Amino acid sequence: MVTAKKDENFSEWYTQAIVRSEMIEYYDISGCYIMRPWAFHIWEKVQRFFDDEIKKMGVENSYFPMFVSRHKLEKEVAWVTHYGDSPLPEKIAIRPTSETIMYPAYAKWIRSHRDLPLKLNQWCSVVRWEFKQPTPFLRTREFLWQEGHTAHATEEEAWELVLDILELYRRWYEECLAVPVIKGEKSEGEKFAGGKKTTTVEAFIPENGRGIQAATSHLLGTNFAKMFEIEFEDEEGHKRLVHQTSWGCTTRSLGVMIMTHGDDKGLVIPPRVASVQVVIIPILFKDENTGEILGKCRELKTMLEKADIRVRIDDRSNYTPGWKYNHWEVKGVPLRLELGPKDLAKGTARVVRRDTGEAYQISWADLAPKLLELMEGIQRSLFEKAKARLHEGIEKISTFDEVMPALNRKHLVLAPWCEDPESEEQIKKETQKLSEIQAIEAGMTGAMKTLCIPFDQPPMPEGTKCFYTGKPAKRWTLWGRSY
Amino acid sequence: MVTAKKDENFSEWYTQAIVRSEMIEYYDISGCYIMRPWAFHIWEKVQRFFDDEIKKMGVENSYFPMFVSRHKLEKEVAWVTHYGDSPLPEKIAIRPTSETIMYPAYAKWIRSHRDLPLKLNQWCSVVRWEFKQPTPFLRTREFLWQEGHTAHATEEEAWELVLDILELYRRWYEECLAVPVIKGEKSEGEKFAGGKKTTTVEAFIPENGRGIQAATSHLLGTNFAKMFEIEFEDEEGHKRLVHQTSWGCTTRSLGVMIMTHGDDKGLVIPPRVASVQVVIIPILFKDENTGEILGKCRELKTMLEKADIRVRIDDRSNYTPGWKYNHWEVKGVPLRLELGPKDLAKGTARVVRRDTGEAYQISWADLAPKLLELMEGIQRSLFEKAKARLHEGIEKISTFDEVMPALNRKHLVLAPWCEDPESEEQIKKETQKLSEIQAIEAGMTGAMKTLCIPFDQPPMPEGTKCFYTGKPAKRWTLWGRSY
Ligand SMILES: Cc1cc(N2CC[C@@](C#N)(C3CC3)C2=O)cc(NC(=O)Cc2ccccc2)n1
Ligand SMILES: Cc1cc(N2CC[C@@](C#N)(C3CC3)C2=O)cc(NC(=O)Cc2ccccc2)n1
Numbered sequence: 001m002v003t004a005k006k007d008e009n010f011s012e013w014y015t016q017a018i019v020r021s022e023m024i025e026y027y028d029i030s031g032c033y034i035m036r037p038w039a040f041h042i043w044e045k046v047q048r049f050f051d052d053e054i055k056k057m058g059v060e061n062s063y064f065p066m067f068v069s070r071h072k073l074e075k076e077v078a079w080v081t082h083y084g085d086s087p088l089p090e091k092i093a094i095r096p097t098s099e100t101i102m103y104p105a106y107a108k109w110i111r112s113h114r115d116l117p118l119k120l121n122q123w124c125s126v127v128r129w130e131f132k133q134p135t136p137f138l139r140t141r142e143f144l145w146q147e148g149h150t151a152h153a154t155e156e157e158a159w160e161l162v163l164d165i166l167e168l169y170r171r172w173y174e175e176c177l178a179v180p181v182i183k184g185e186k187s188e189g190e191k192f193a194g195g196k197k198t199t200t201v202e203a204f205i206p207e208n209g210r211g212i213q214a215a216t217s218h219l220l221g222t223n224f225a226k227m228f229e230i231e232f233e234d235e236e237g238h239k240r241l242v243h244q245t246s247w248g249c250t251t252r253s254l255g256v257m258i259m260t261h262g263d264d265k266g267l268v269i270p271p272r273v274a275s276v277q278v279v280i281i282p283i284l285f286k287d288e289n290t291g292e293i294l295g296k297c298r299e300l301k302t303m304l305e306k307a308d309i310r311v312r313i314d315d316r317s318n319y320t321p322g323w324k325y326n327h328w329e330v331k332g333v334p335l336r337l338e339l340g341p342k343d344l345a346k347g348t349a350r351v352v353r354r355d356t357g358e359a360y361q362i363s364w365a366d367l368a369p370k371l372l373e374l375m376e377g378i379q380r381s382l383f384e385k386a387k388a389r390l391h392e393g394i395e396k397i398s399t400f401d402e403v404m405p406a407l408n409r410k411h412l413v414l415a416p417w418c419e420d421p422e423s424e425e426q427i428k429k430e431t432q433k434l435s436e437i438q439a440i441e442a443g444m445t446g447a448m449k450t451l452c453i454p455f456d457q458p459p460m461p462e463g464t465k466c467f468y469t470g471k472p473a474k475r476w477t478l479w480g481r482s483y
Numbered sequence: 484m485v486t487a488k489k490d491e492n493f494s495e496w497y498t499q500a501i502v503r504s505e506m507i508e509y510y511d512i513s514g515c516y517i518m519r520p521w522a523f524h525i526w527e528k529v530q531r532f533f534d535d536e537i538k539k540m541g542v543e544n545s546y547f548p549m550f551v552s553r554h555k556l557e558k559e560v561a562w563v564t565h566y567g568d569s570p571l572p573e574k575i576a577i578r579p580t581s582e583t584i585m586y587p588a589y590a591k592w593i594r595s596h597r598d599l600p601l602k603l604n605q606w607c608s609v610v611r612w613e614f615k616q617p618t619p620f621l622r623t624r625e626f627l628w629q630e631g632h633t634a635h636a637t638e639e640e641a642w643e644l645v646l647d648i649l650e651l652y653r654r655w656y657e658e659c660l661a662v663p664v665i666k667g668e669k670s671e672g673e674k675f676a677g678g679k680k681t682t683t684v685e686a687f688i689p690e691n692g693r694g695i696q697a698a699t700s701h702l703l704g705t706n707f708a709k710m711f712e713i714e715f716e717d718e719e720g721h722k723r724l725v726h727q728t729s730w731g732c733t734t735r736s737l738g739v740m741i742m743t744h745g746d747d748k749g750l751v752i753p754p755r756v757a758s759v760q761v762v763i764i765p766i767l768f769k770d771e772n773t774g775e776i777l778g779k780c781r782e783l784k785t786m787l788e789k790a791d792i793r794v795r796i797d798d799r800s801n802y803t804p805g806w807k808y809n810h811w812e813v814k815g816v817p818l819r820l821e822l823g824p825k826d827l828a829k830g831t832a833r834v835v836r837r838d839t840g841e842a843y844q845i846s847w848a849d850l851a852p853k854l855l856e857l858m859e860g861i862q863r864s865l866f867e868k869a870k871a872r873l874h875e876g877i878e879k880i881s882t883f884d885e886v887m888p889a890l891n892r893k894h895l896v897l898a899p900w901c902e903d904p905e906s907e908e909q910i911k912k913e914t915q916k917l918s919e920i921q922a923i924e925a926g927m928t929g930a931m932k933t934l935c936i937p938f939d940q941p942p943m944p945e946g947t948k949c950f951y952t953g954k955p956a957k958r959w960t961l962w963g964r965s966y
Contacts, residue, residue, distance in 0.1 A: 028552055029548060029550050034547050035545060035547075036545055040543070062518060065510055065516075065625055066549075072511065078563045083560065092512060142549055
């Protein structure tokens with residue numbers, strides 16, 4: 001049983017939810033966590049979704065080495081310096097990302113416009129060795145991801161791909177994980193080092209008021225092509241720099257999903273990614289025809305699987321139905337199906353949905369289409385409720401004086417901004433200081449930073465001033481405390 | 484074009500075959516190679532096969548960290564000692580294998596016999612940092628693999644799983660990759676450190692006479708359970724050690740496939756793993772109805788894909804058909820389909836098989852079933868020819884005096900052996916010395932070691948003596964030079 005309340009001690013709630021559901025195990029190296037099958041299966045599902053989608057775009061998978069030489073990297077990094085006891089003459093780094101590993105090869109492979117576009121992806125893990133507090137799934141020292149890297153003859157084609165991938169990330173979060181996200185452009189201070197423009201999808205954790213970057217898609221432009229001499233010839237033979245993109249998304253997505261839909265009973269997993277969509281729990285009275293009940297459960301499982309419903313029967317005789325109900329609730333199975341002698345006699349089954357607890361009596365003949373309908377209802381309900389919480393979590397403001405009250409309500413702020421990079425640094429420092437003072441009156445950082453400049457922009461009145469500098473505002477920008 | 488001959492300079496042939504087909508790219512860290520899509524797709528195919536098969540056994544995937552603490556590992560390793568410039572207080576190692584990473588968790592997770600069997604697998608890369616000459620695919624410093632790890636209430640159930648997995652590895656090599664392998668038991672000196680009994684499938688490279696371990700499946704017994712205190716209670720409450728297995732297989736399999744089937748024109752890829760099974764090459768005379776020809780090629784592609792045949796049309800107008808024929812031969816596509824105006828007029832297509840060059844004229848209505856039949860014929864032919872070469876490569880001998888002649892014929896030897904571990908060390912040293920002398924008369928190591936003790940044992944006459952010690956022979960053992 002989960003016993004911390006999600007709305008009272010969120011940190012303890014999260015730990016209990018992911019440990020008691022058997023998703024994670026701890027490890028004696030800080031910032032690294034074991035992903036057990038209950039979590040890993042969800043990763044496999046979103047991996048298959050994204051892989052199928054980028055394959056349709058002509059992206060192909062590959063595998064590049066986990067090590068990068070010092071001079072290539074330096075053209076929060078873990079450095080290998082010894083094999084056994086023998087020092088290496090040049091230290092080598094574990095990849096935090098693979099631009100410097102892949103792009104010398106790109107420079108070799110690309111010669112003609114006929115070689116473009118080049119589109120590669122790899123599924124691997126990377127290491128970003130930071131000393132700040134790690135969080136299971138959300139912010140870890142090693143994490144699983146995919147990184148895609150493309151090169152194009154024109155900036156416009158590269159940008160179109162940046163946005164196509166960002167839309168795939170929106171679908172990963174909203175359509176698979178039922179997590180609402182906001183598409184936007186990163187600030188100059190927050191964009192990828194060396195890139196031209198970084199786009200992002202941002203999510204929100206209401207219980208601690210924090211934004212979090214859900215995935216990222218970078219227009220690198222010609223910057224890395226200049227760095228690595230990646231050029232192509234047109235048909236007349238003139239050499240030009242390629243235009244590049246890089247994009248990535250990680251197991252952070254699972255953590256965001258967990259935090260968005262979980263409740264006081266534990267996990268709630270959206271049906272579209274749940275490894276068990278329906279758990280069948282037979283009633284096993286000592287004084288019943290148990291073989292008949294179990295046989296009917298097997299028949300129902302076969303029937304549901306013909307509709308591609310993922311089913312598990314928990315026929316263990318050493319646990320009670322009440323124990324099983326709690327067990328699979330903690331694990332987030334979206335539907336429970338109960339079958340006992342009285343149901344058998346009626347030709348029906350009792351189905352309980354995990355998100356609301358509502359129960360249904362459903363005839364066996366109706367079971368497959370009704371459960372498909374119910375699972376789409378659960379998926380949409382999880383998304384719509386999360387989207388309403390996202391909406392309620394964003395305050396539209398006009399001046400910096402409104403920031404700290406809004407942050408104290410654990411909200412994000414949407415504010416007109418002049419987009420001066422110095423002003424973002426100053427806002428970060430000032431909000432951190434004010435947060436510290438408030439903490440001392442009270443008995444992760446308190447700084448507010450930009451999350452993104454949203455693609456969907458409210459109207460900007462003619463003389464609207466920047467909320468911090470008073471200079472002419474340029475765009476509406478989303479800010480908050482952040483991971 | 485490949486221009487080194489496979490039977491004249493095998494090393495150069497192999498390099499040309501894997502580079503000119505765009506399977507590999509070199510890298511500025513020795514022993515690490517980039518896997519380009521043409522190779523990576525084959526890895527994806529065998530990964531899907533093996534993953535589906537172990538899922539049917541109740542194995543579930545997971546992900547454990549790439550780092551292991553020094554004391555846990557030490558309860559050819561690359562050591563991380565710094566993040567940026569900050570030294571760590573305890574150095575941490577990159578996994579060469581994950582027993583010491585996973586089994587503390589196993590000890591925590593396993594409490595009751597009801598928790599058994601526990602069956603986990605992960606797909607990842609590992610690092611074994613050796614200074615010997617590396618070989619693309621076959622012997623690398625970092626390599627992709629899967630490692631499976633199971634725990635059972637009895638030794639017999641664990642052993643049954645060891646053999647079930649070994650059979651899956653036989654299917655991986657023989658049924659997917661059309662590479663014949665020999666199942667056997669490793670010698671005491673060659674078995675997994677800490678394990679009870681190691682089983683193996685061994686393959687053979689005729690051109691350099693070398694055996695190579697294709698995959699491995701270990702009965703760990705209770706040894707690691709003792710090391711890590713992995714115990715379970717029976718229903719009456721007595722604690723007993725679990726019985727464990729570990730097994731692994733790597734991208735080495737791709738290299739073995741390449742070496743087994745390739746020819747002087749380049750790669751030959753078995754249809755069951757070829758990412759392009761049929762390449763359609765339209766004839767594109769300037770004075771023809773090119774749109775009609777290309778339209779028919781599209782129709783044929785759709786028809787073939789309804790039979791799950793993997794098809795690519797090479798409709799590039801800037802290369803000749805002869806250029807395309809060579810291009811896709813070098814890449815190992817098992818079937819080429821040619822279509823020009825005269826074929827269109829006849830309602831047929833011309834199909835050329837990559838392994839033998841035989842051509843067929845096939846009606847469009849017959850195309851799908853005939854090509855399925857032809858691909859199964861190519862697959863079986865590749866396997867049967869490789870199996871005959873394996874058979875011709877093994878000499879059954881009686882005394883050590885016959886070893887060096889057989890090795891000079893680039894053969895393996897099957898010999899009666901007393902199985903004394905000291906005798907294996909002495910045979911290794913003696914054959915290395917004799918090889919060195921022969922080298923100096925002539926203008927990788929020359930040592931002969933055990934490859935395995937095959938499951939399929941010839942009859943052992945009553946008084947048969949060991950070929951090296953003259954003591955009573957115990958079993959027939961397969962020896963050769965080795966990777
Ligand atoms: C699990 C996960 C995810 C991500 N990040 C980054 C942005 C990104 C996005 N979008 C990546 C480009 C794809 C993402 O997901 C980052 C991380 N760890 C770290 O920064 C290291 C760390 C560890 C402990 C505390 C503080 C920092 N850990
Ligand atoms: C690609 C690949 C494969 C394998 N091995 C091992 C046995 C095994 C089997 N069966 C593993 C258990 C699964 C296998 O495939 C091993 C390796 N590198 C190494 O030993 C490191 C190395 C590098 C250069 C020269 C010498 C040694 N490199």
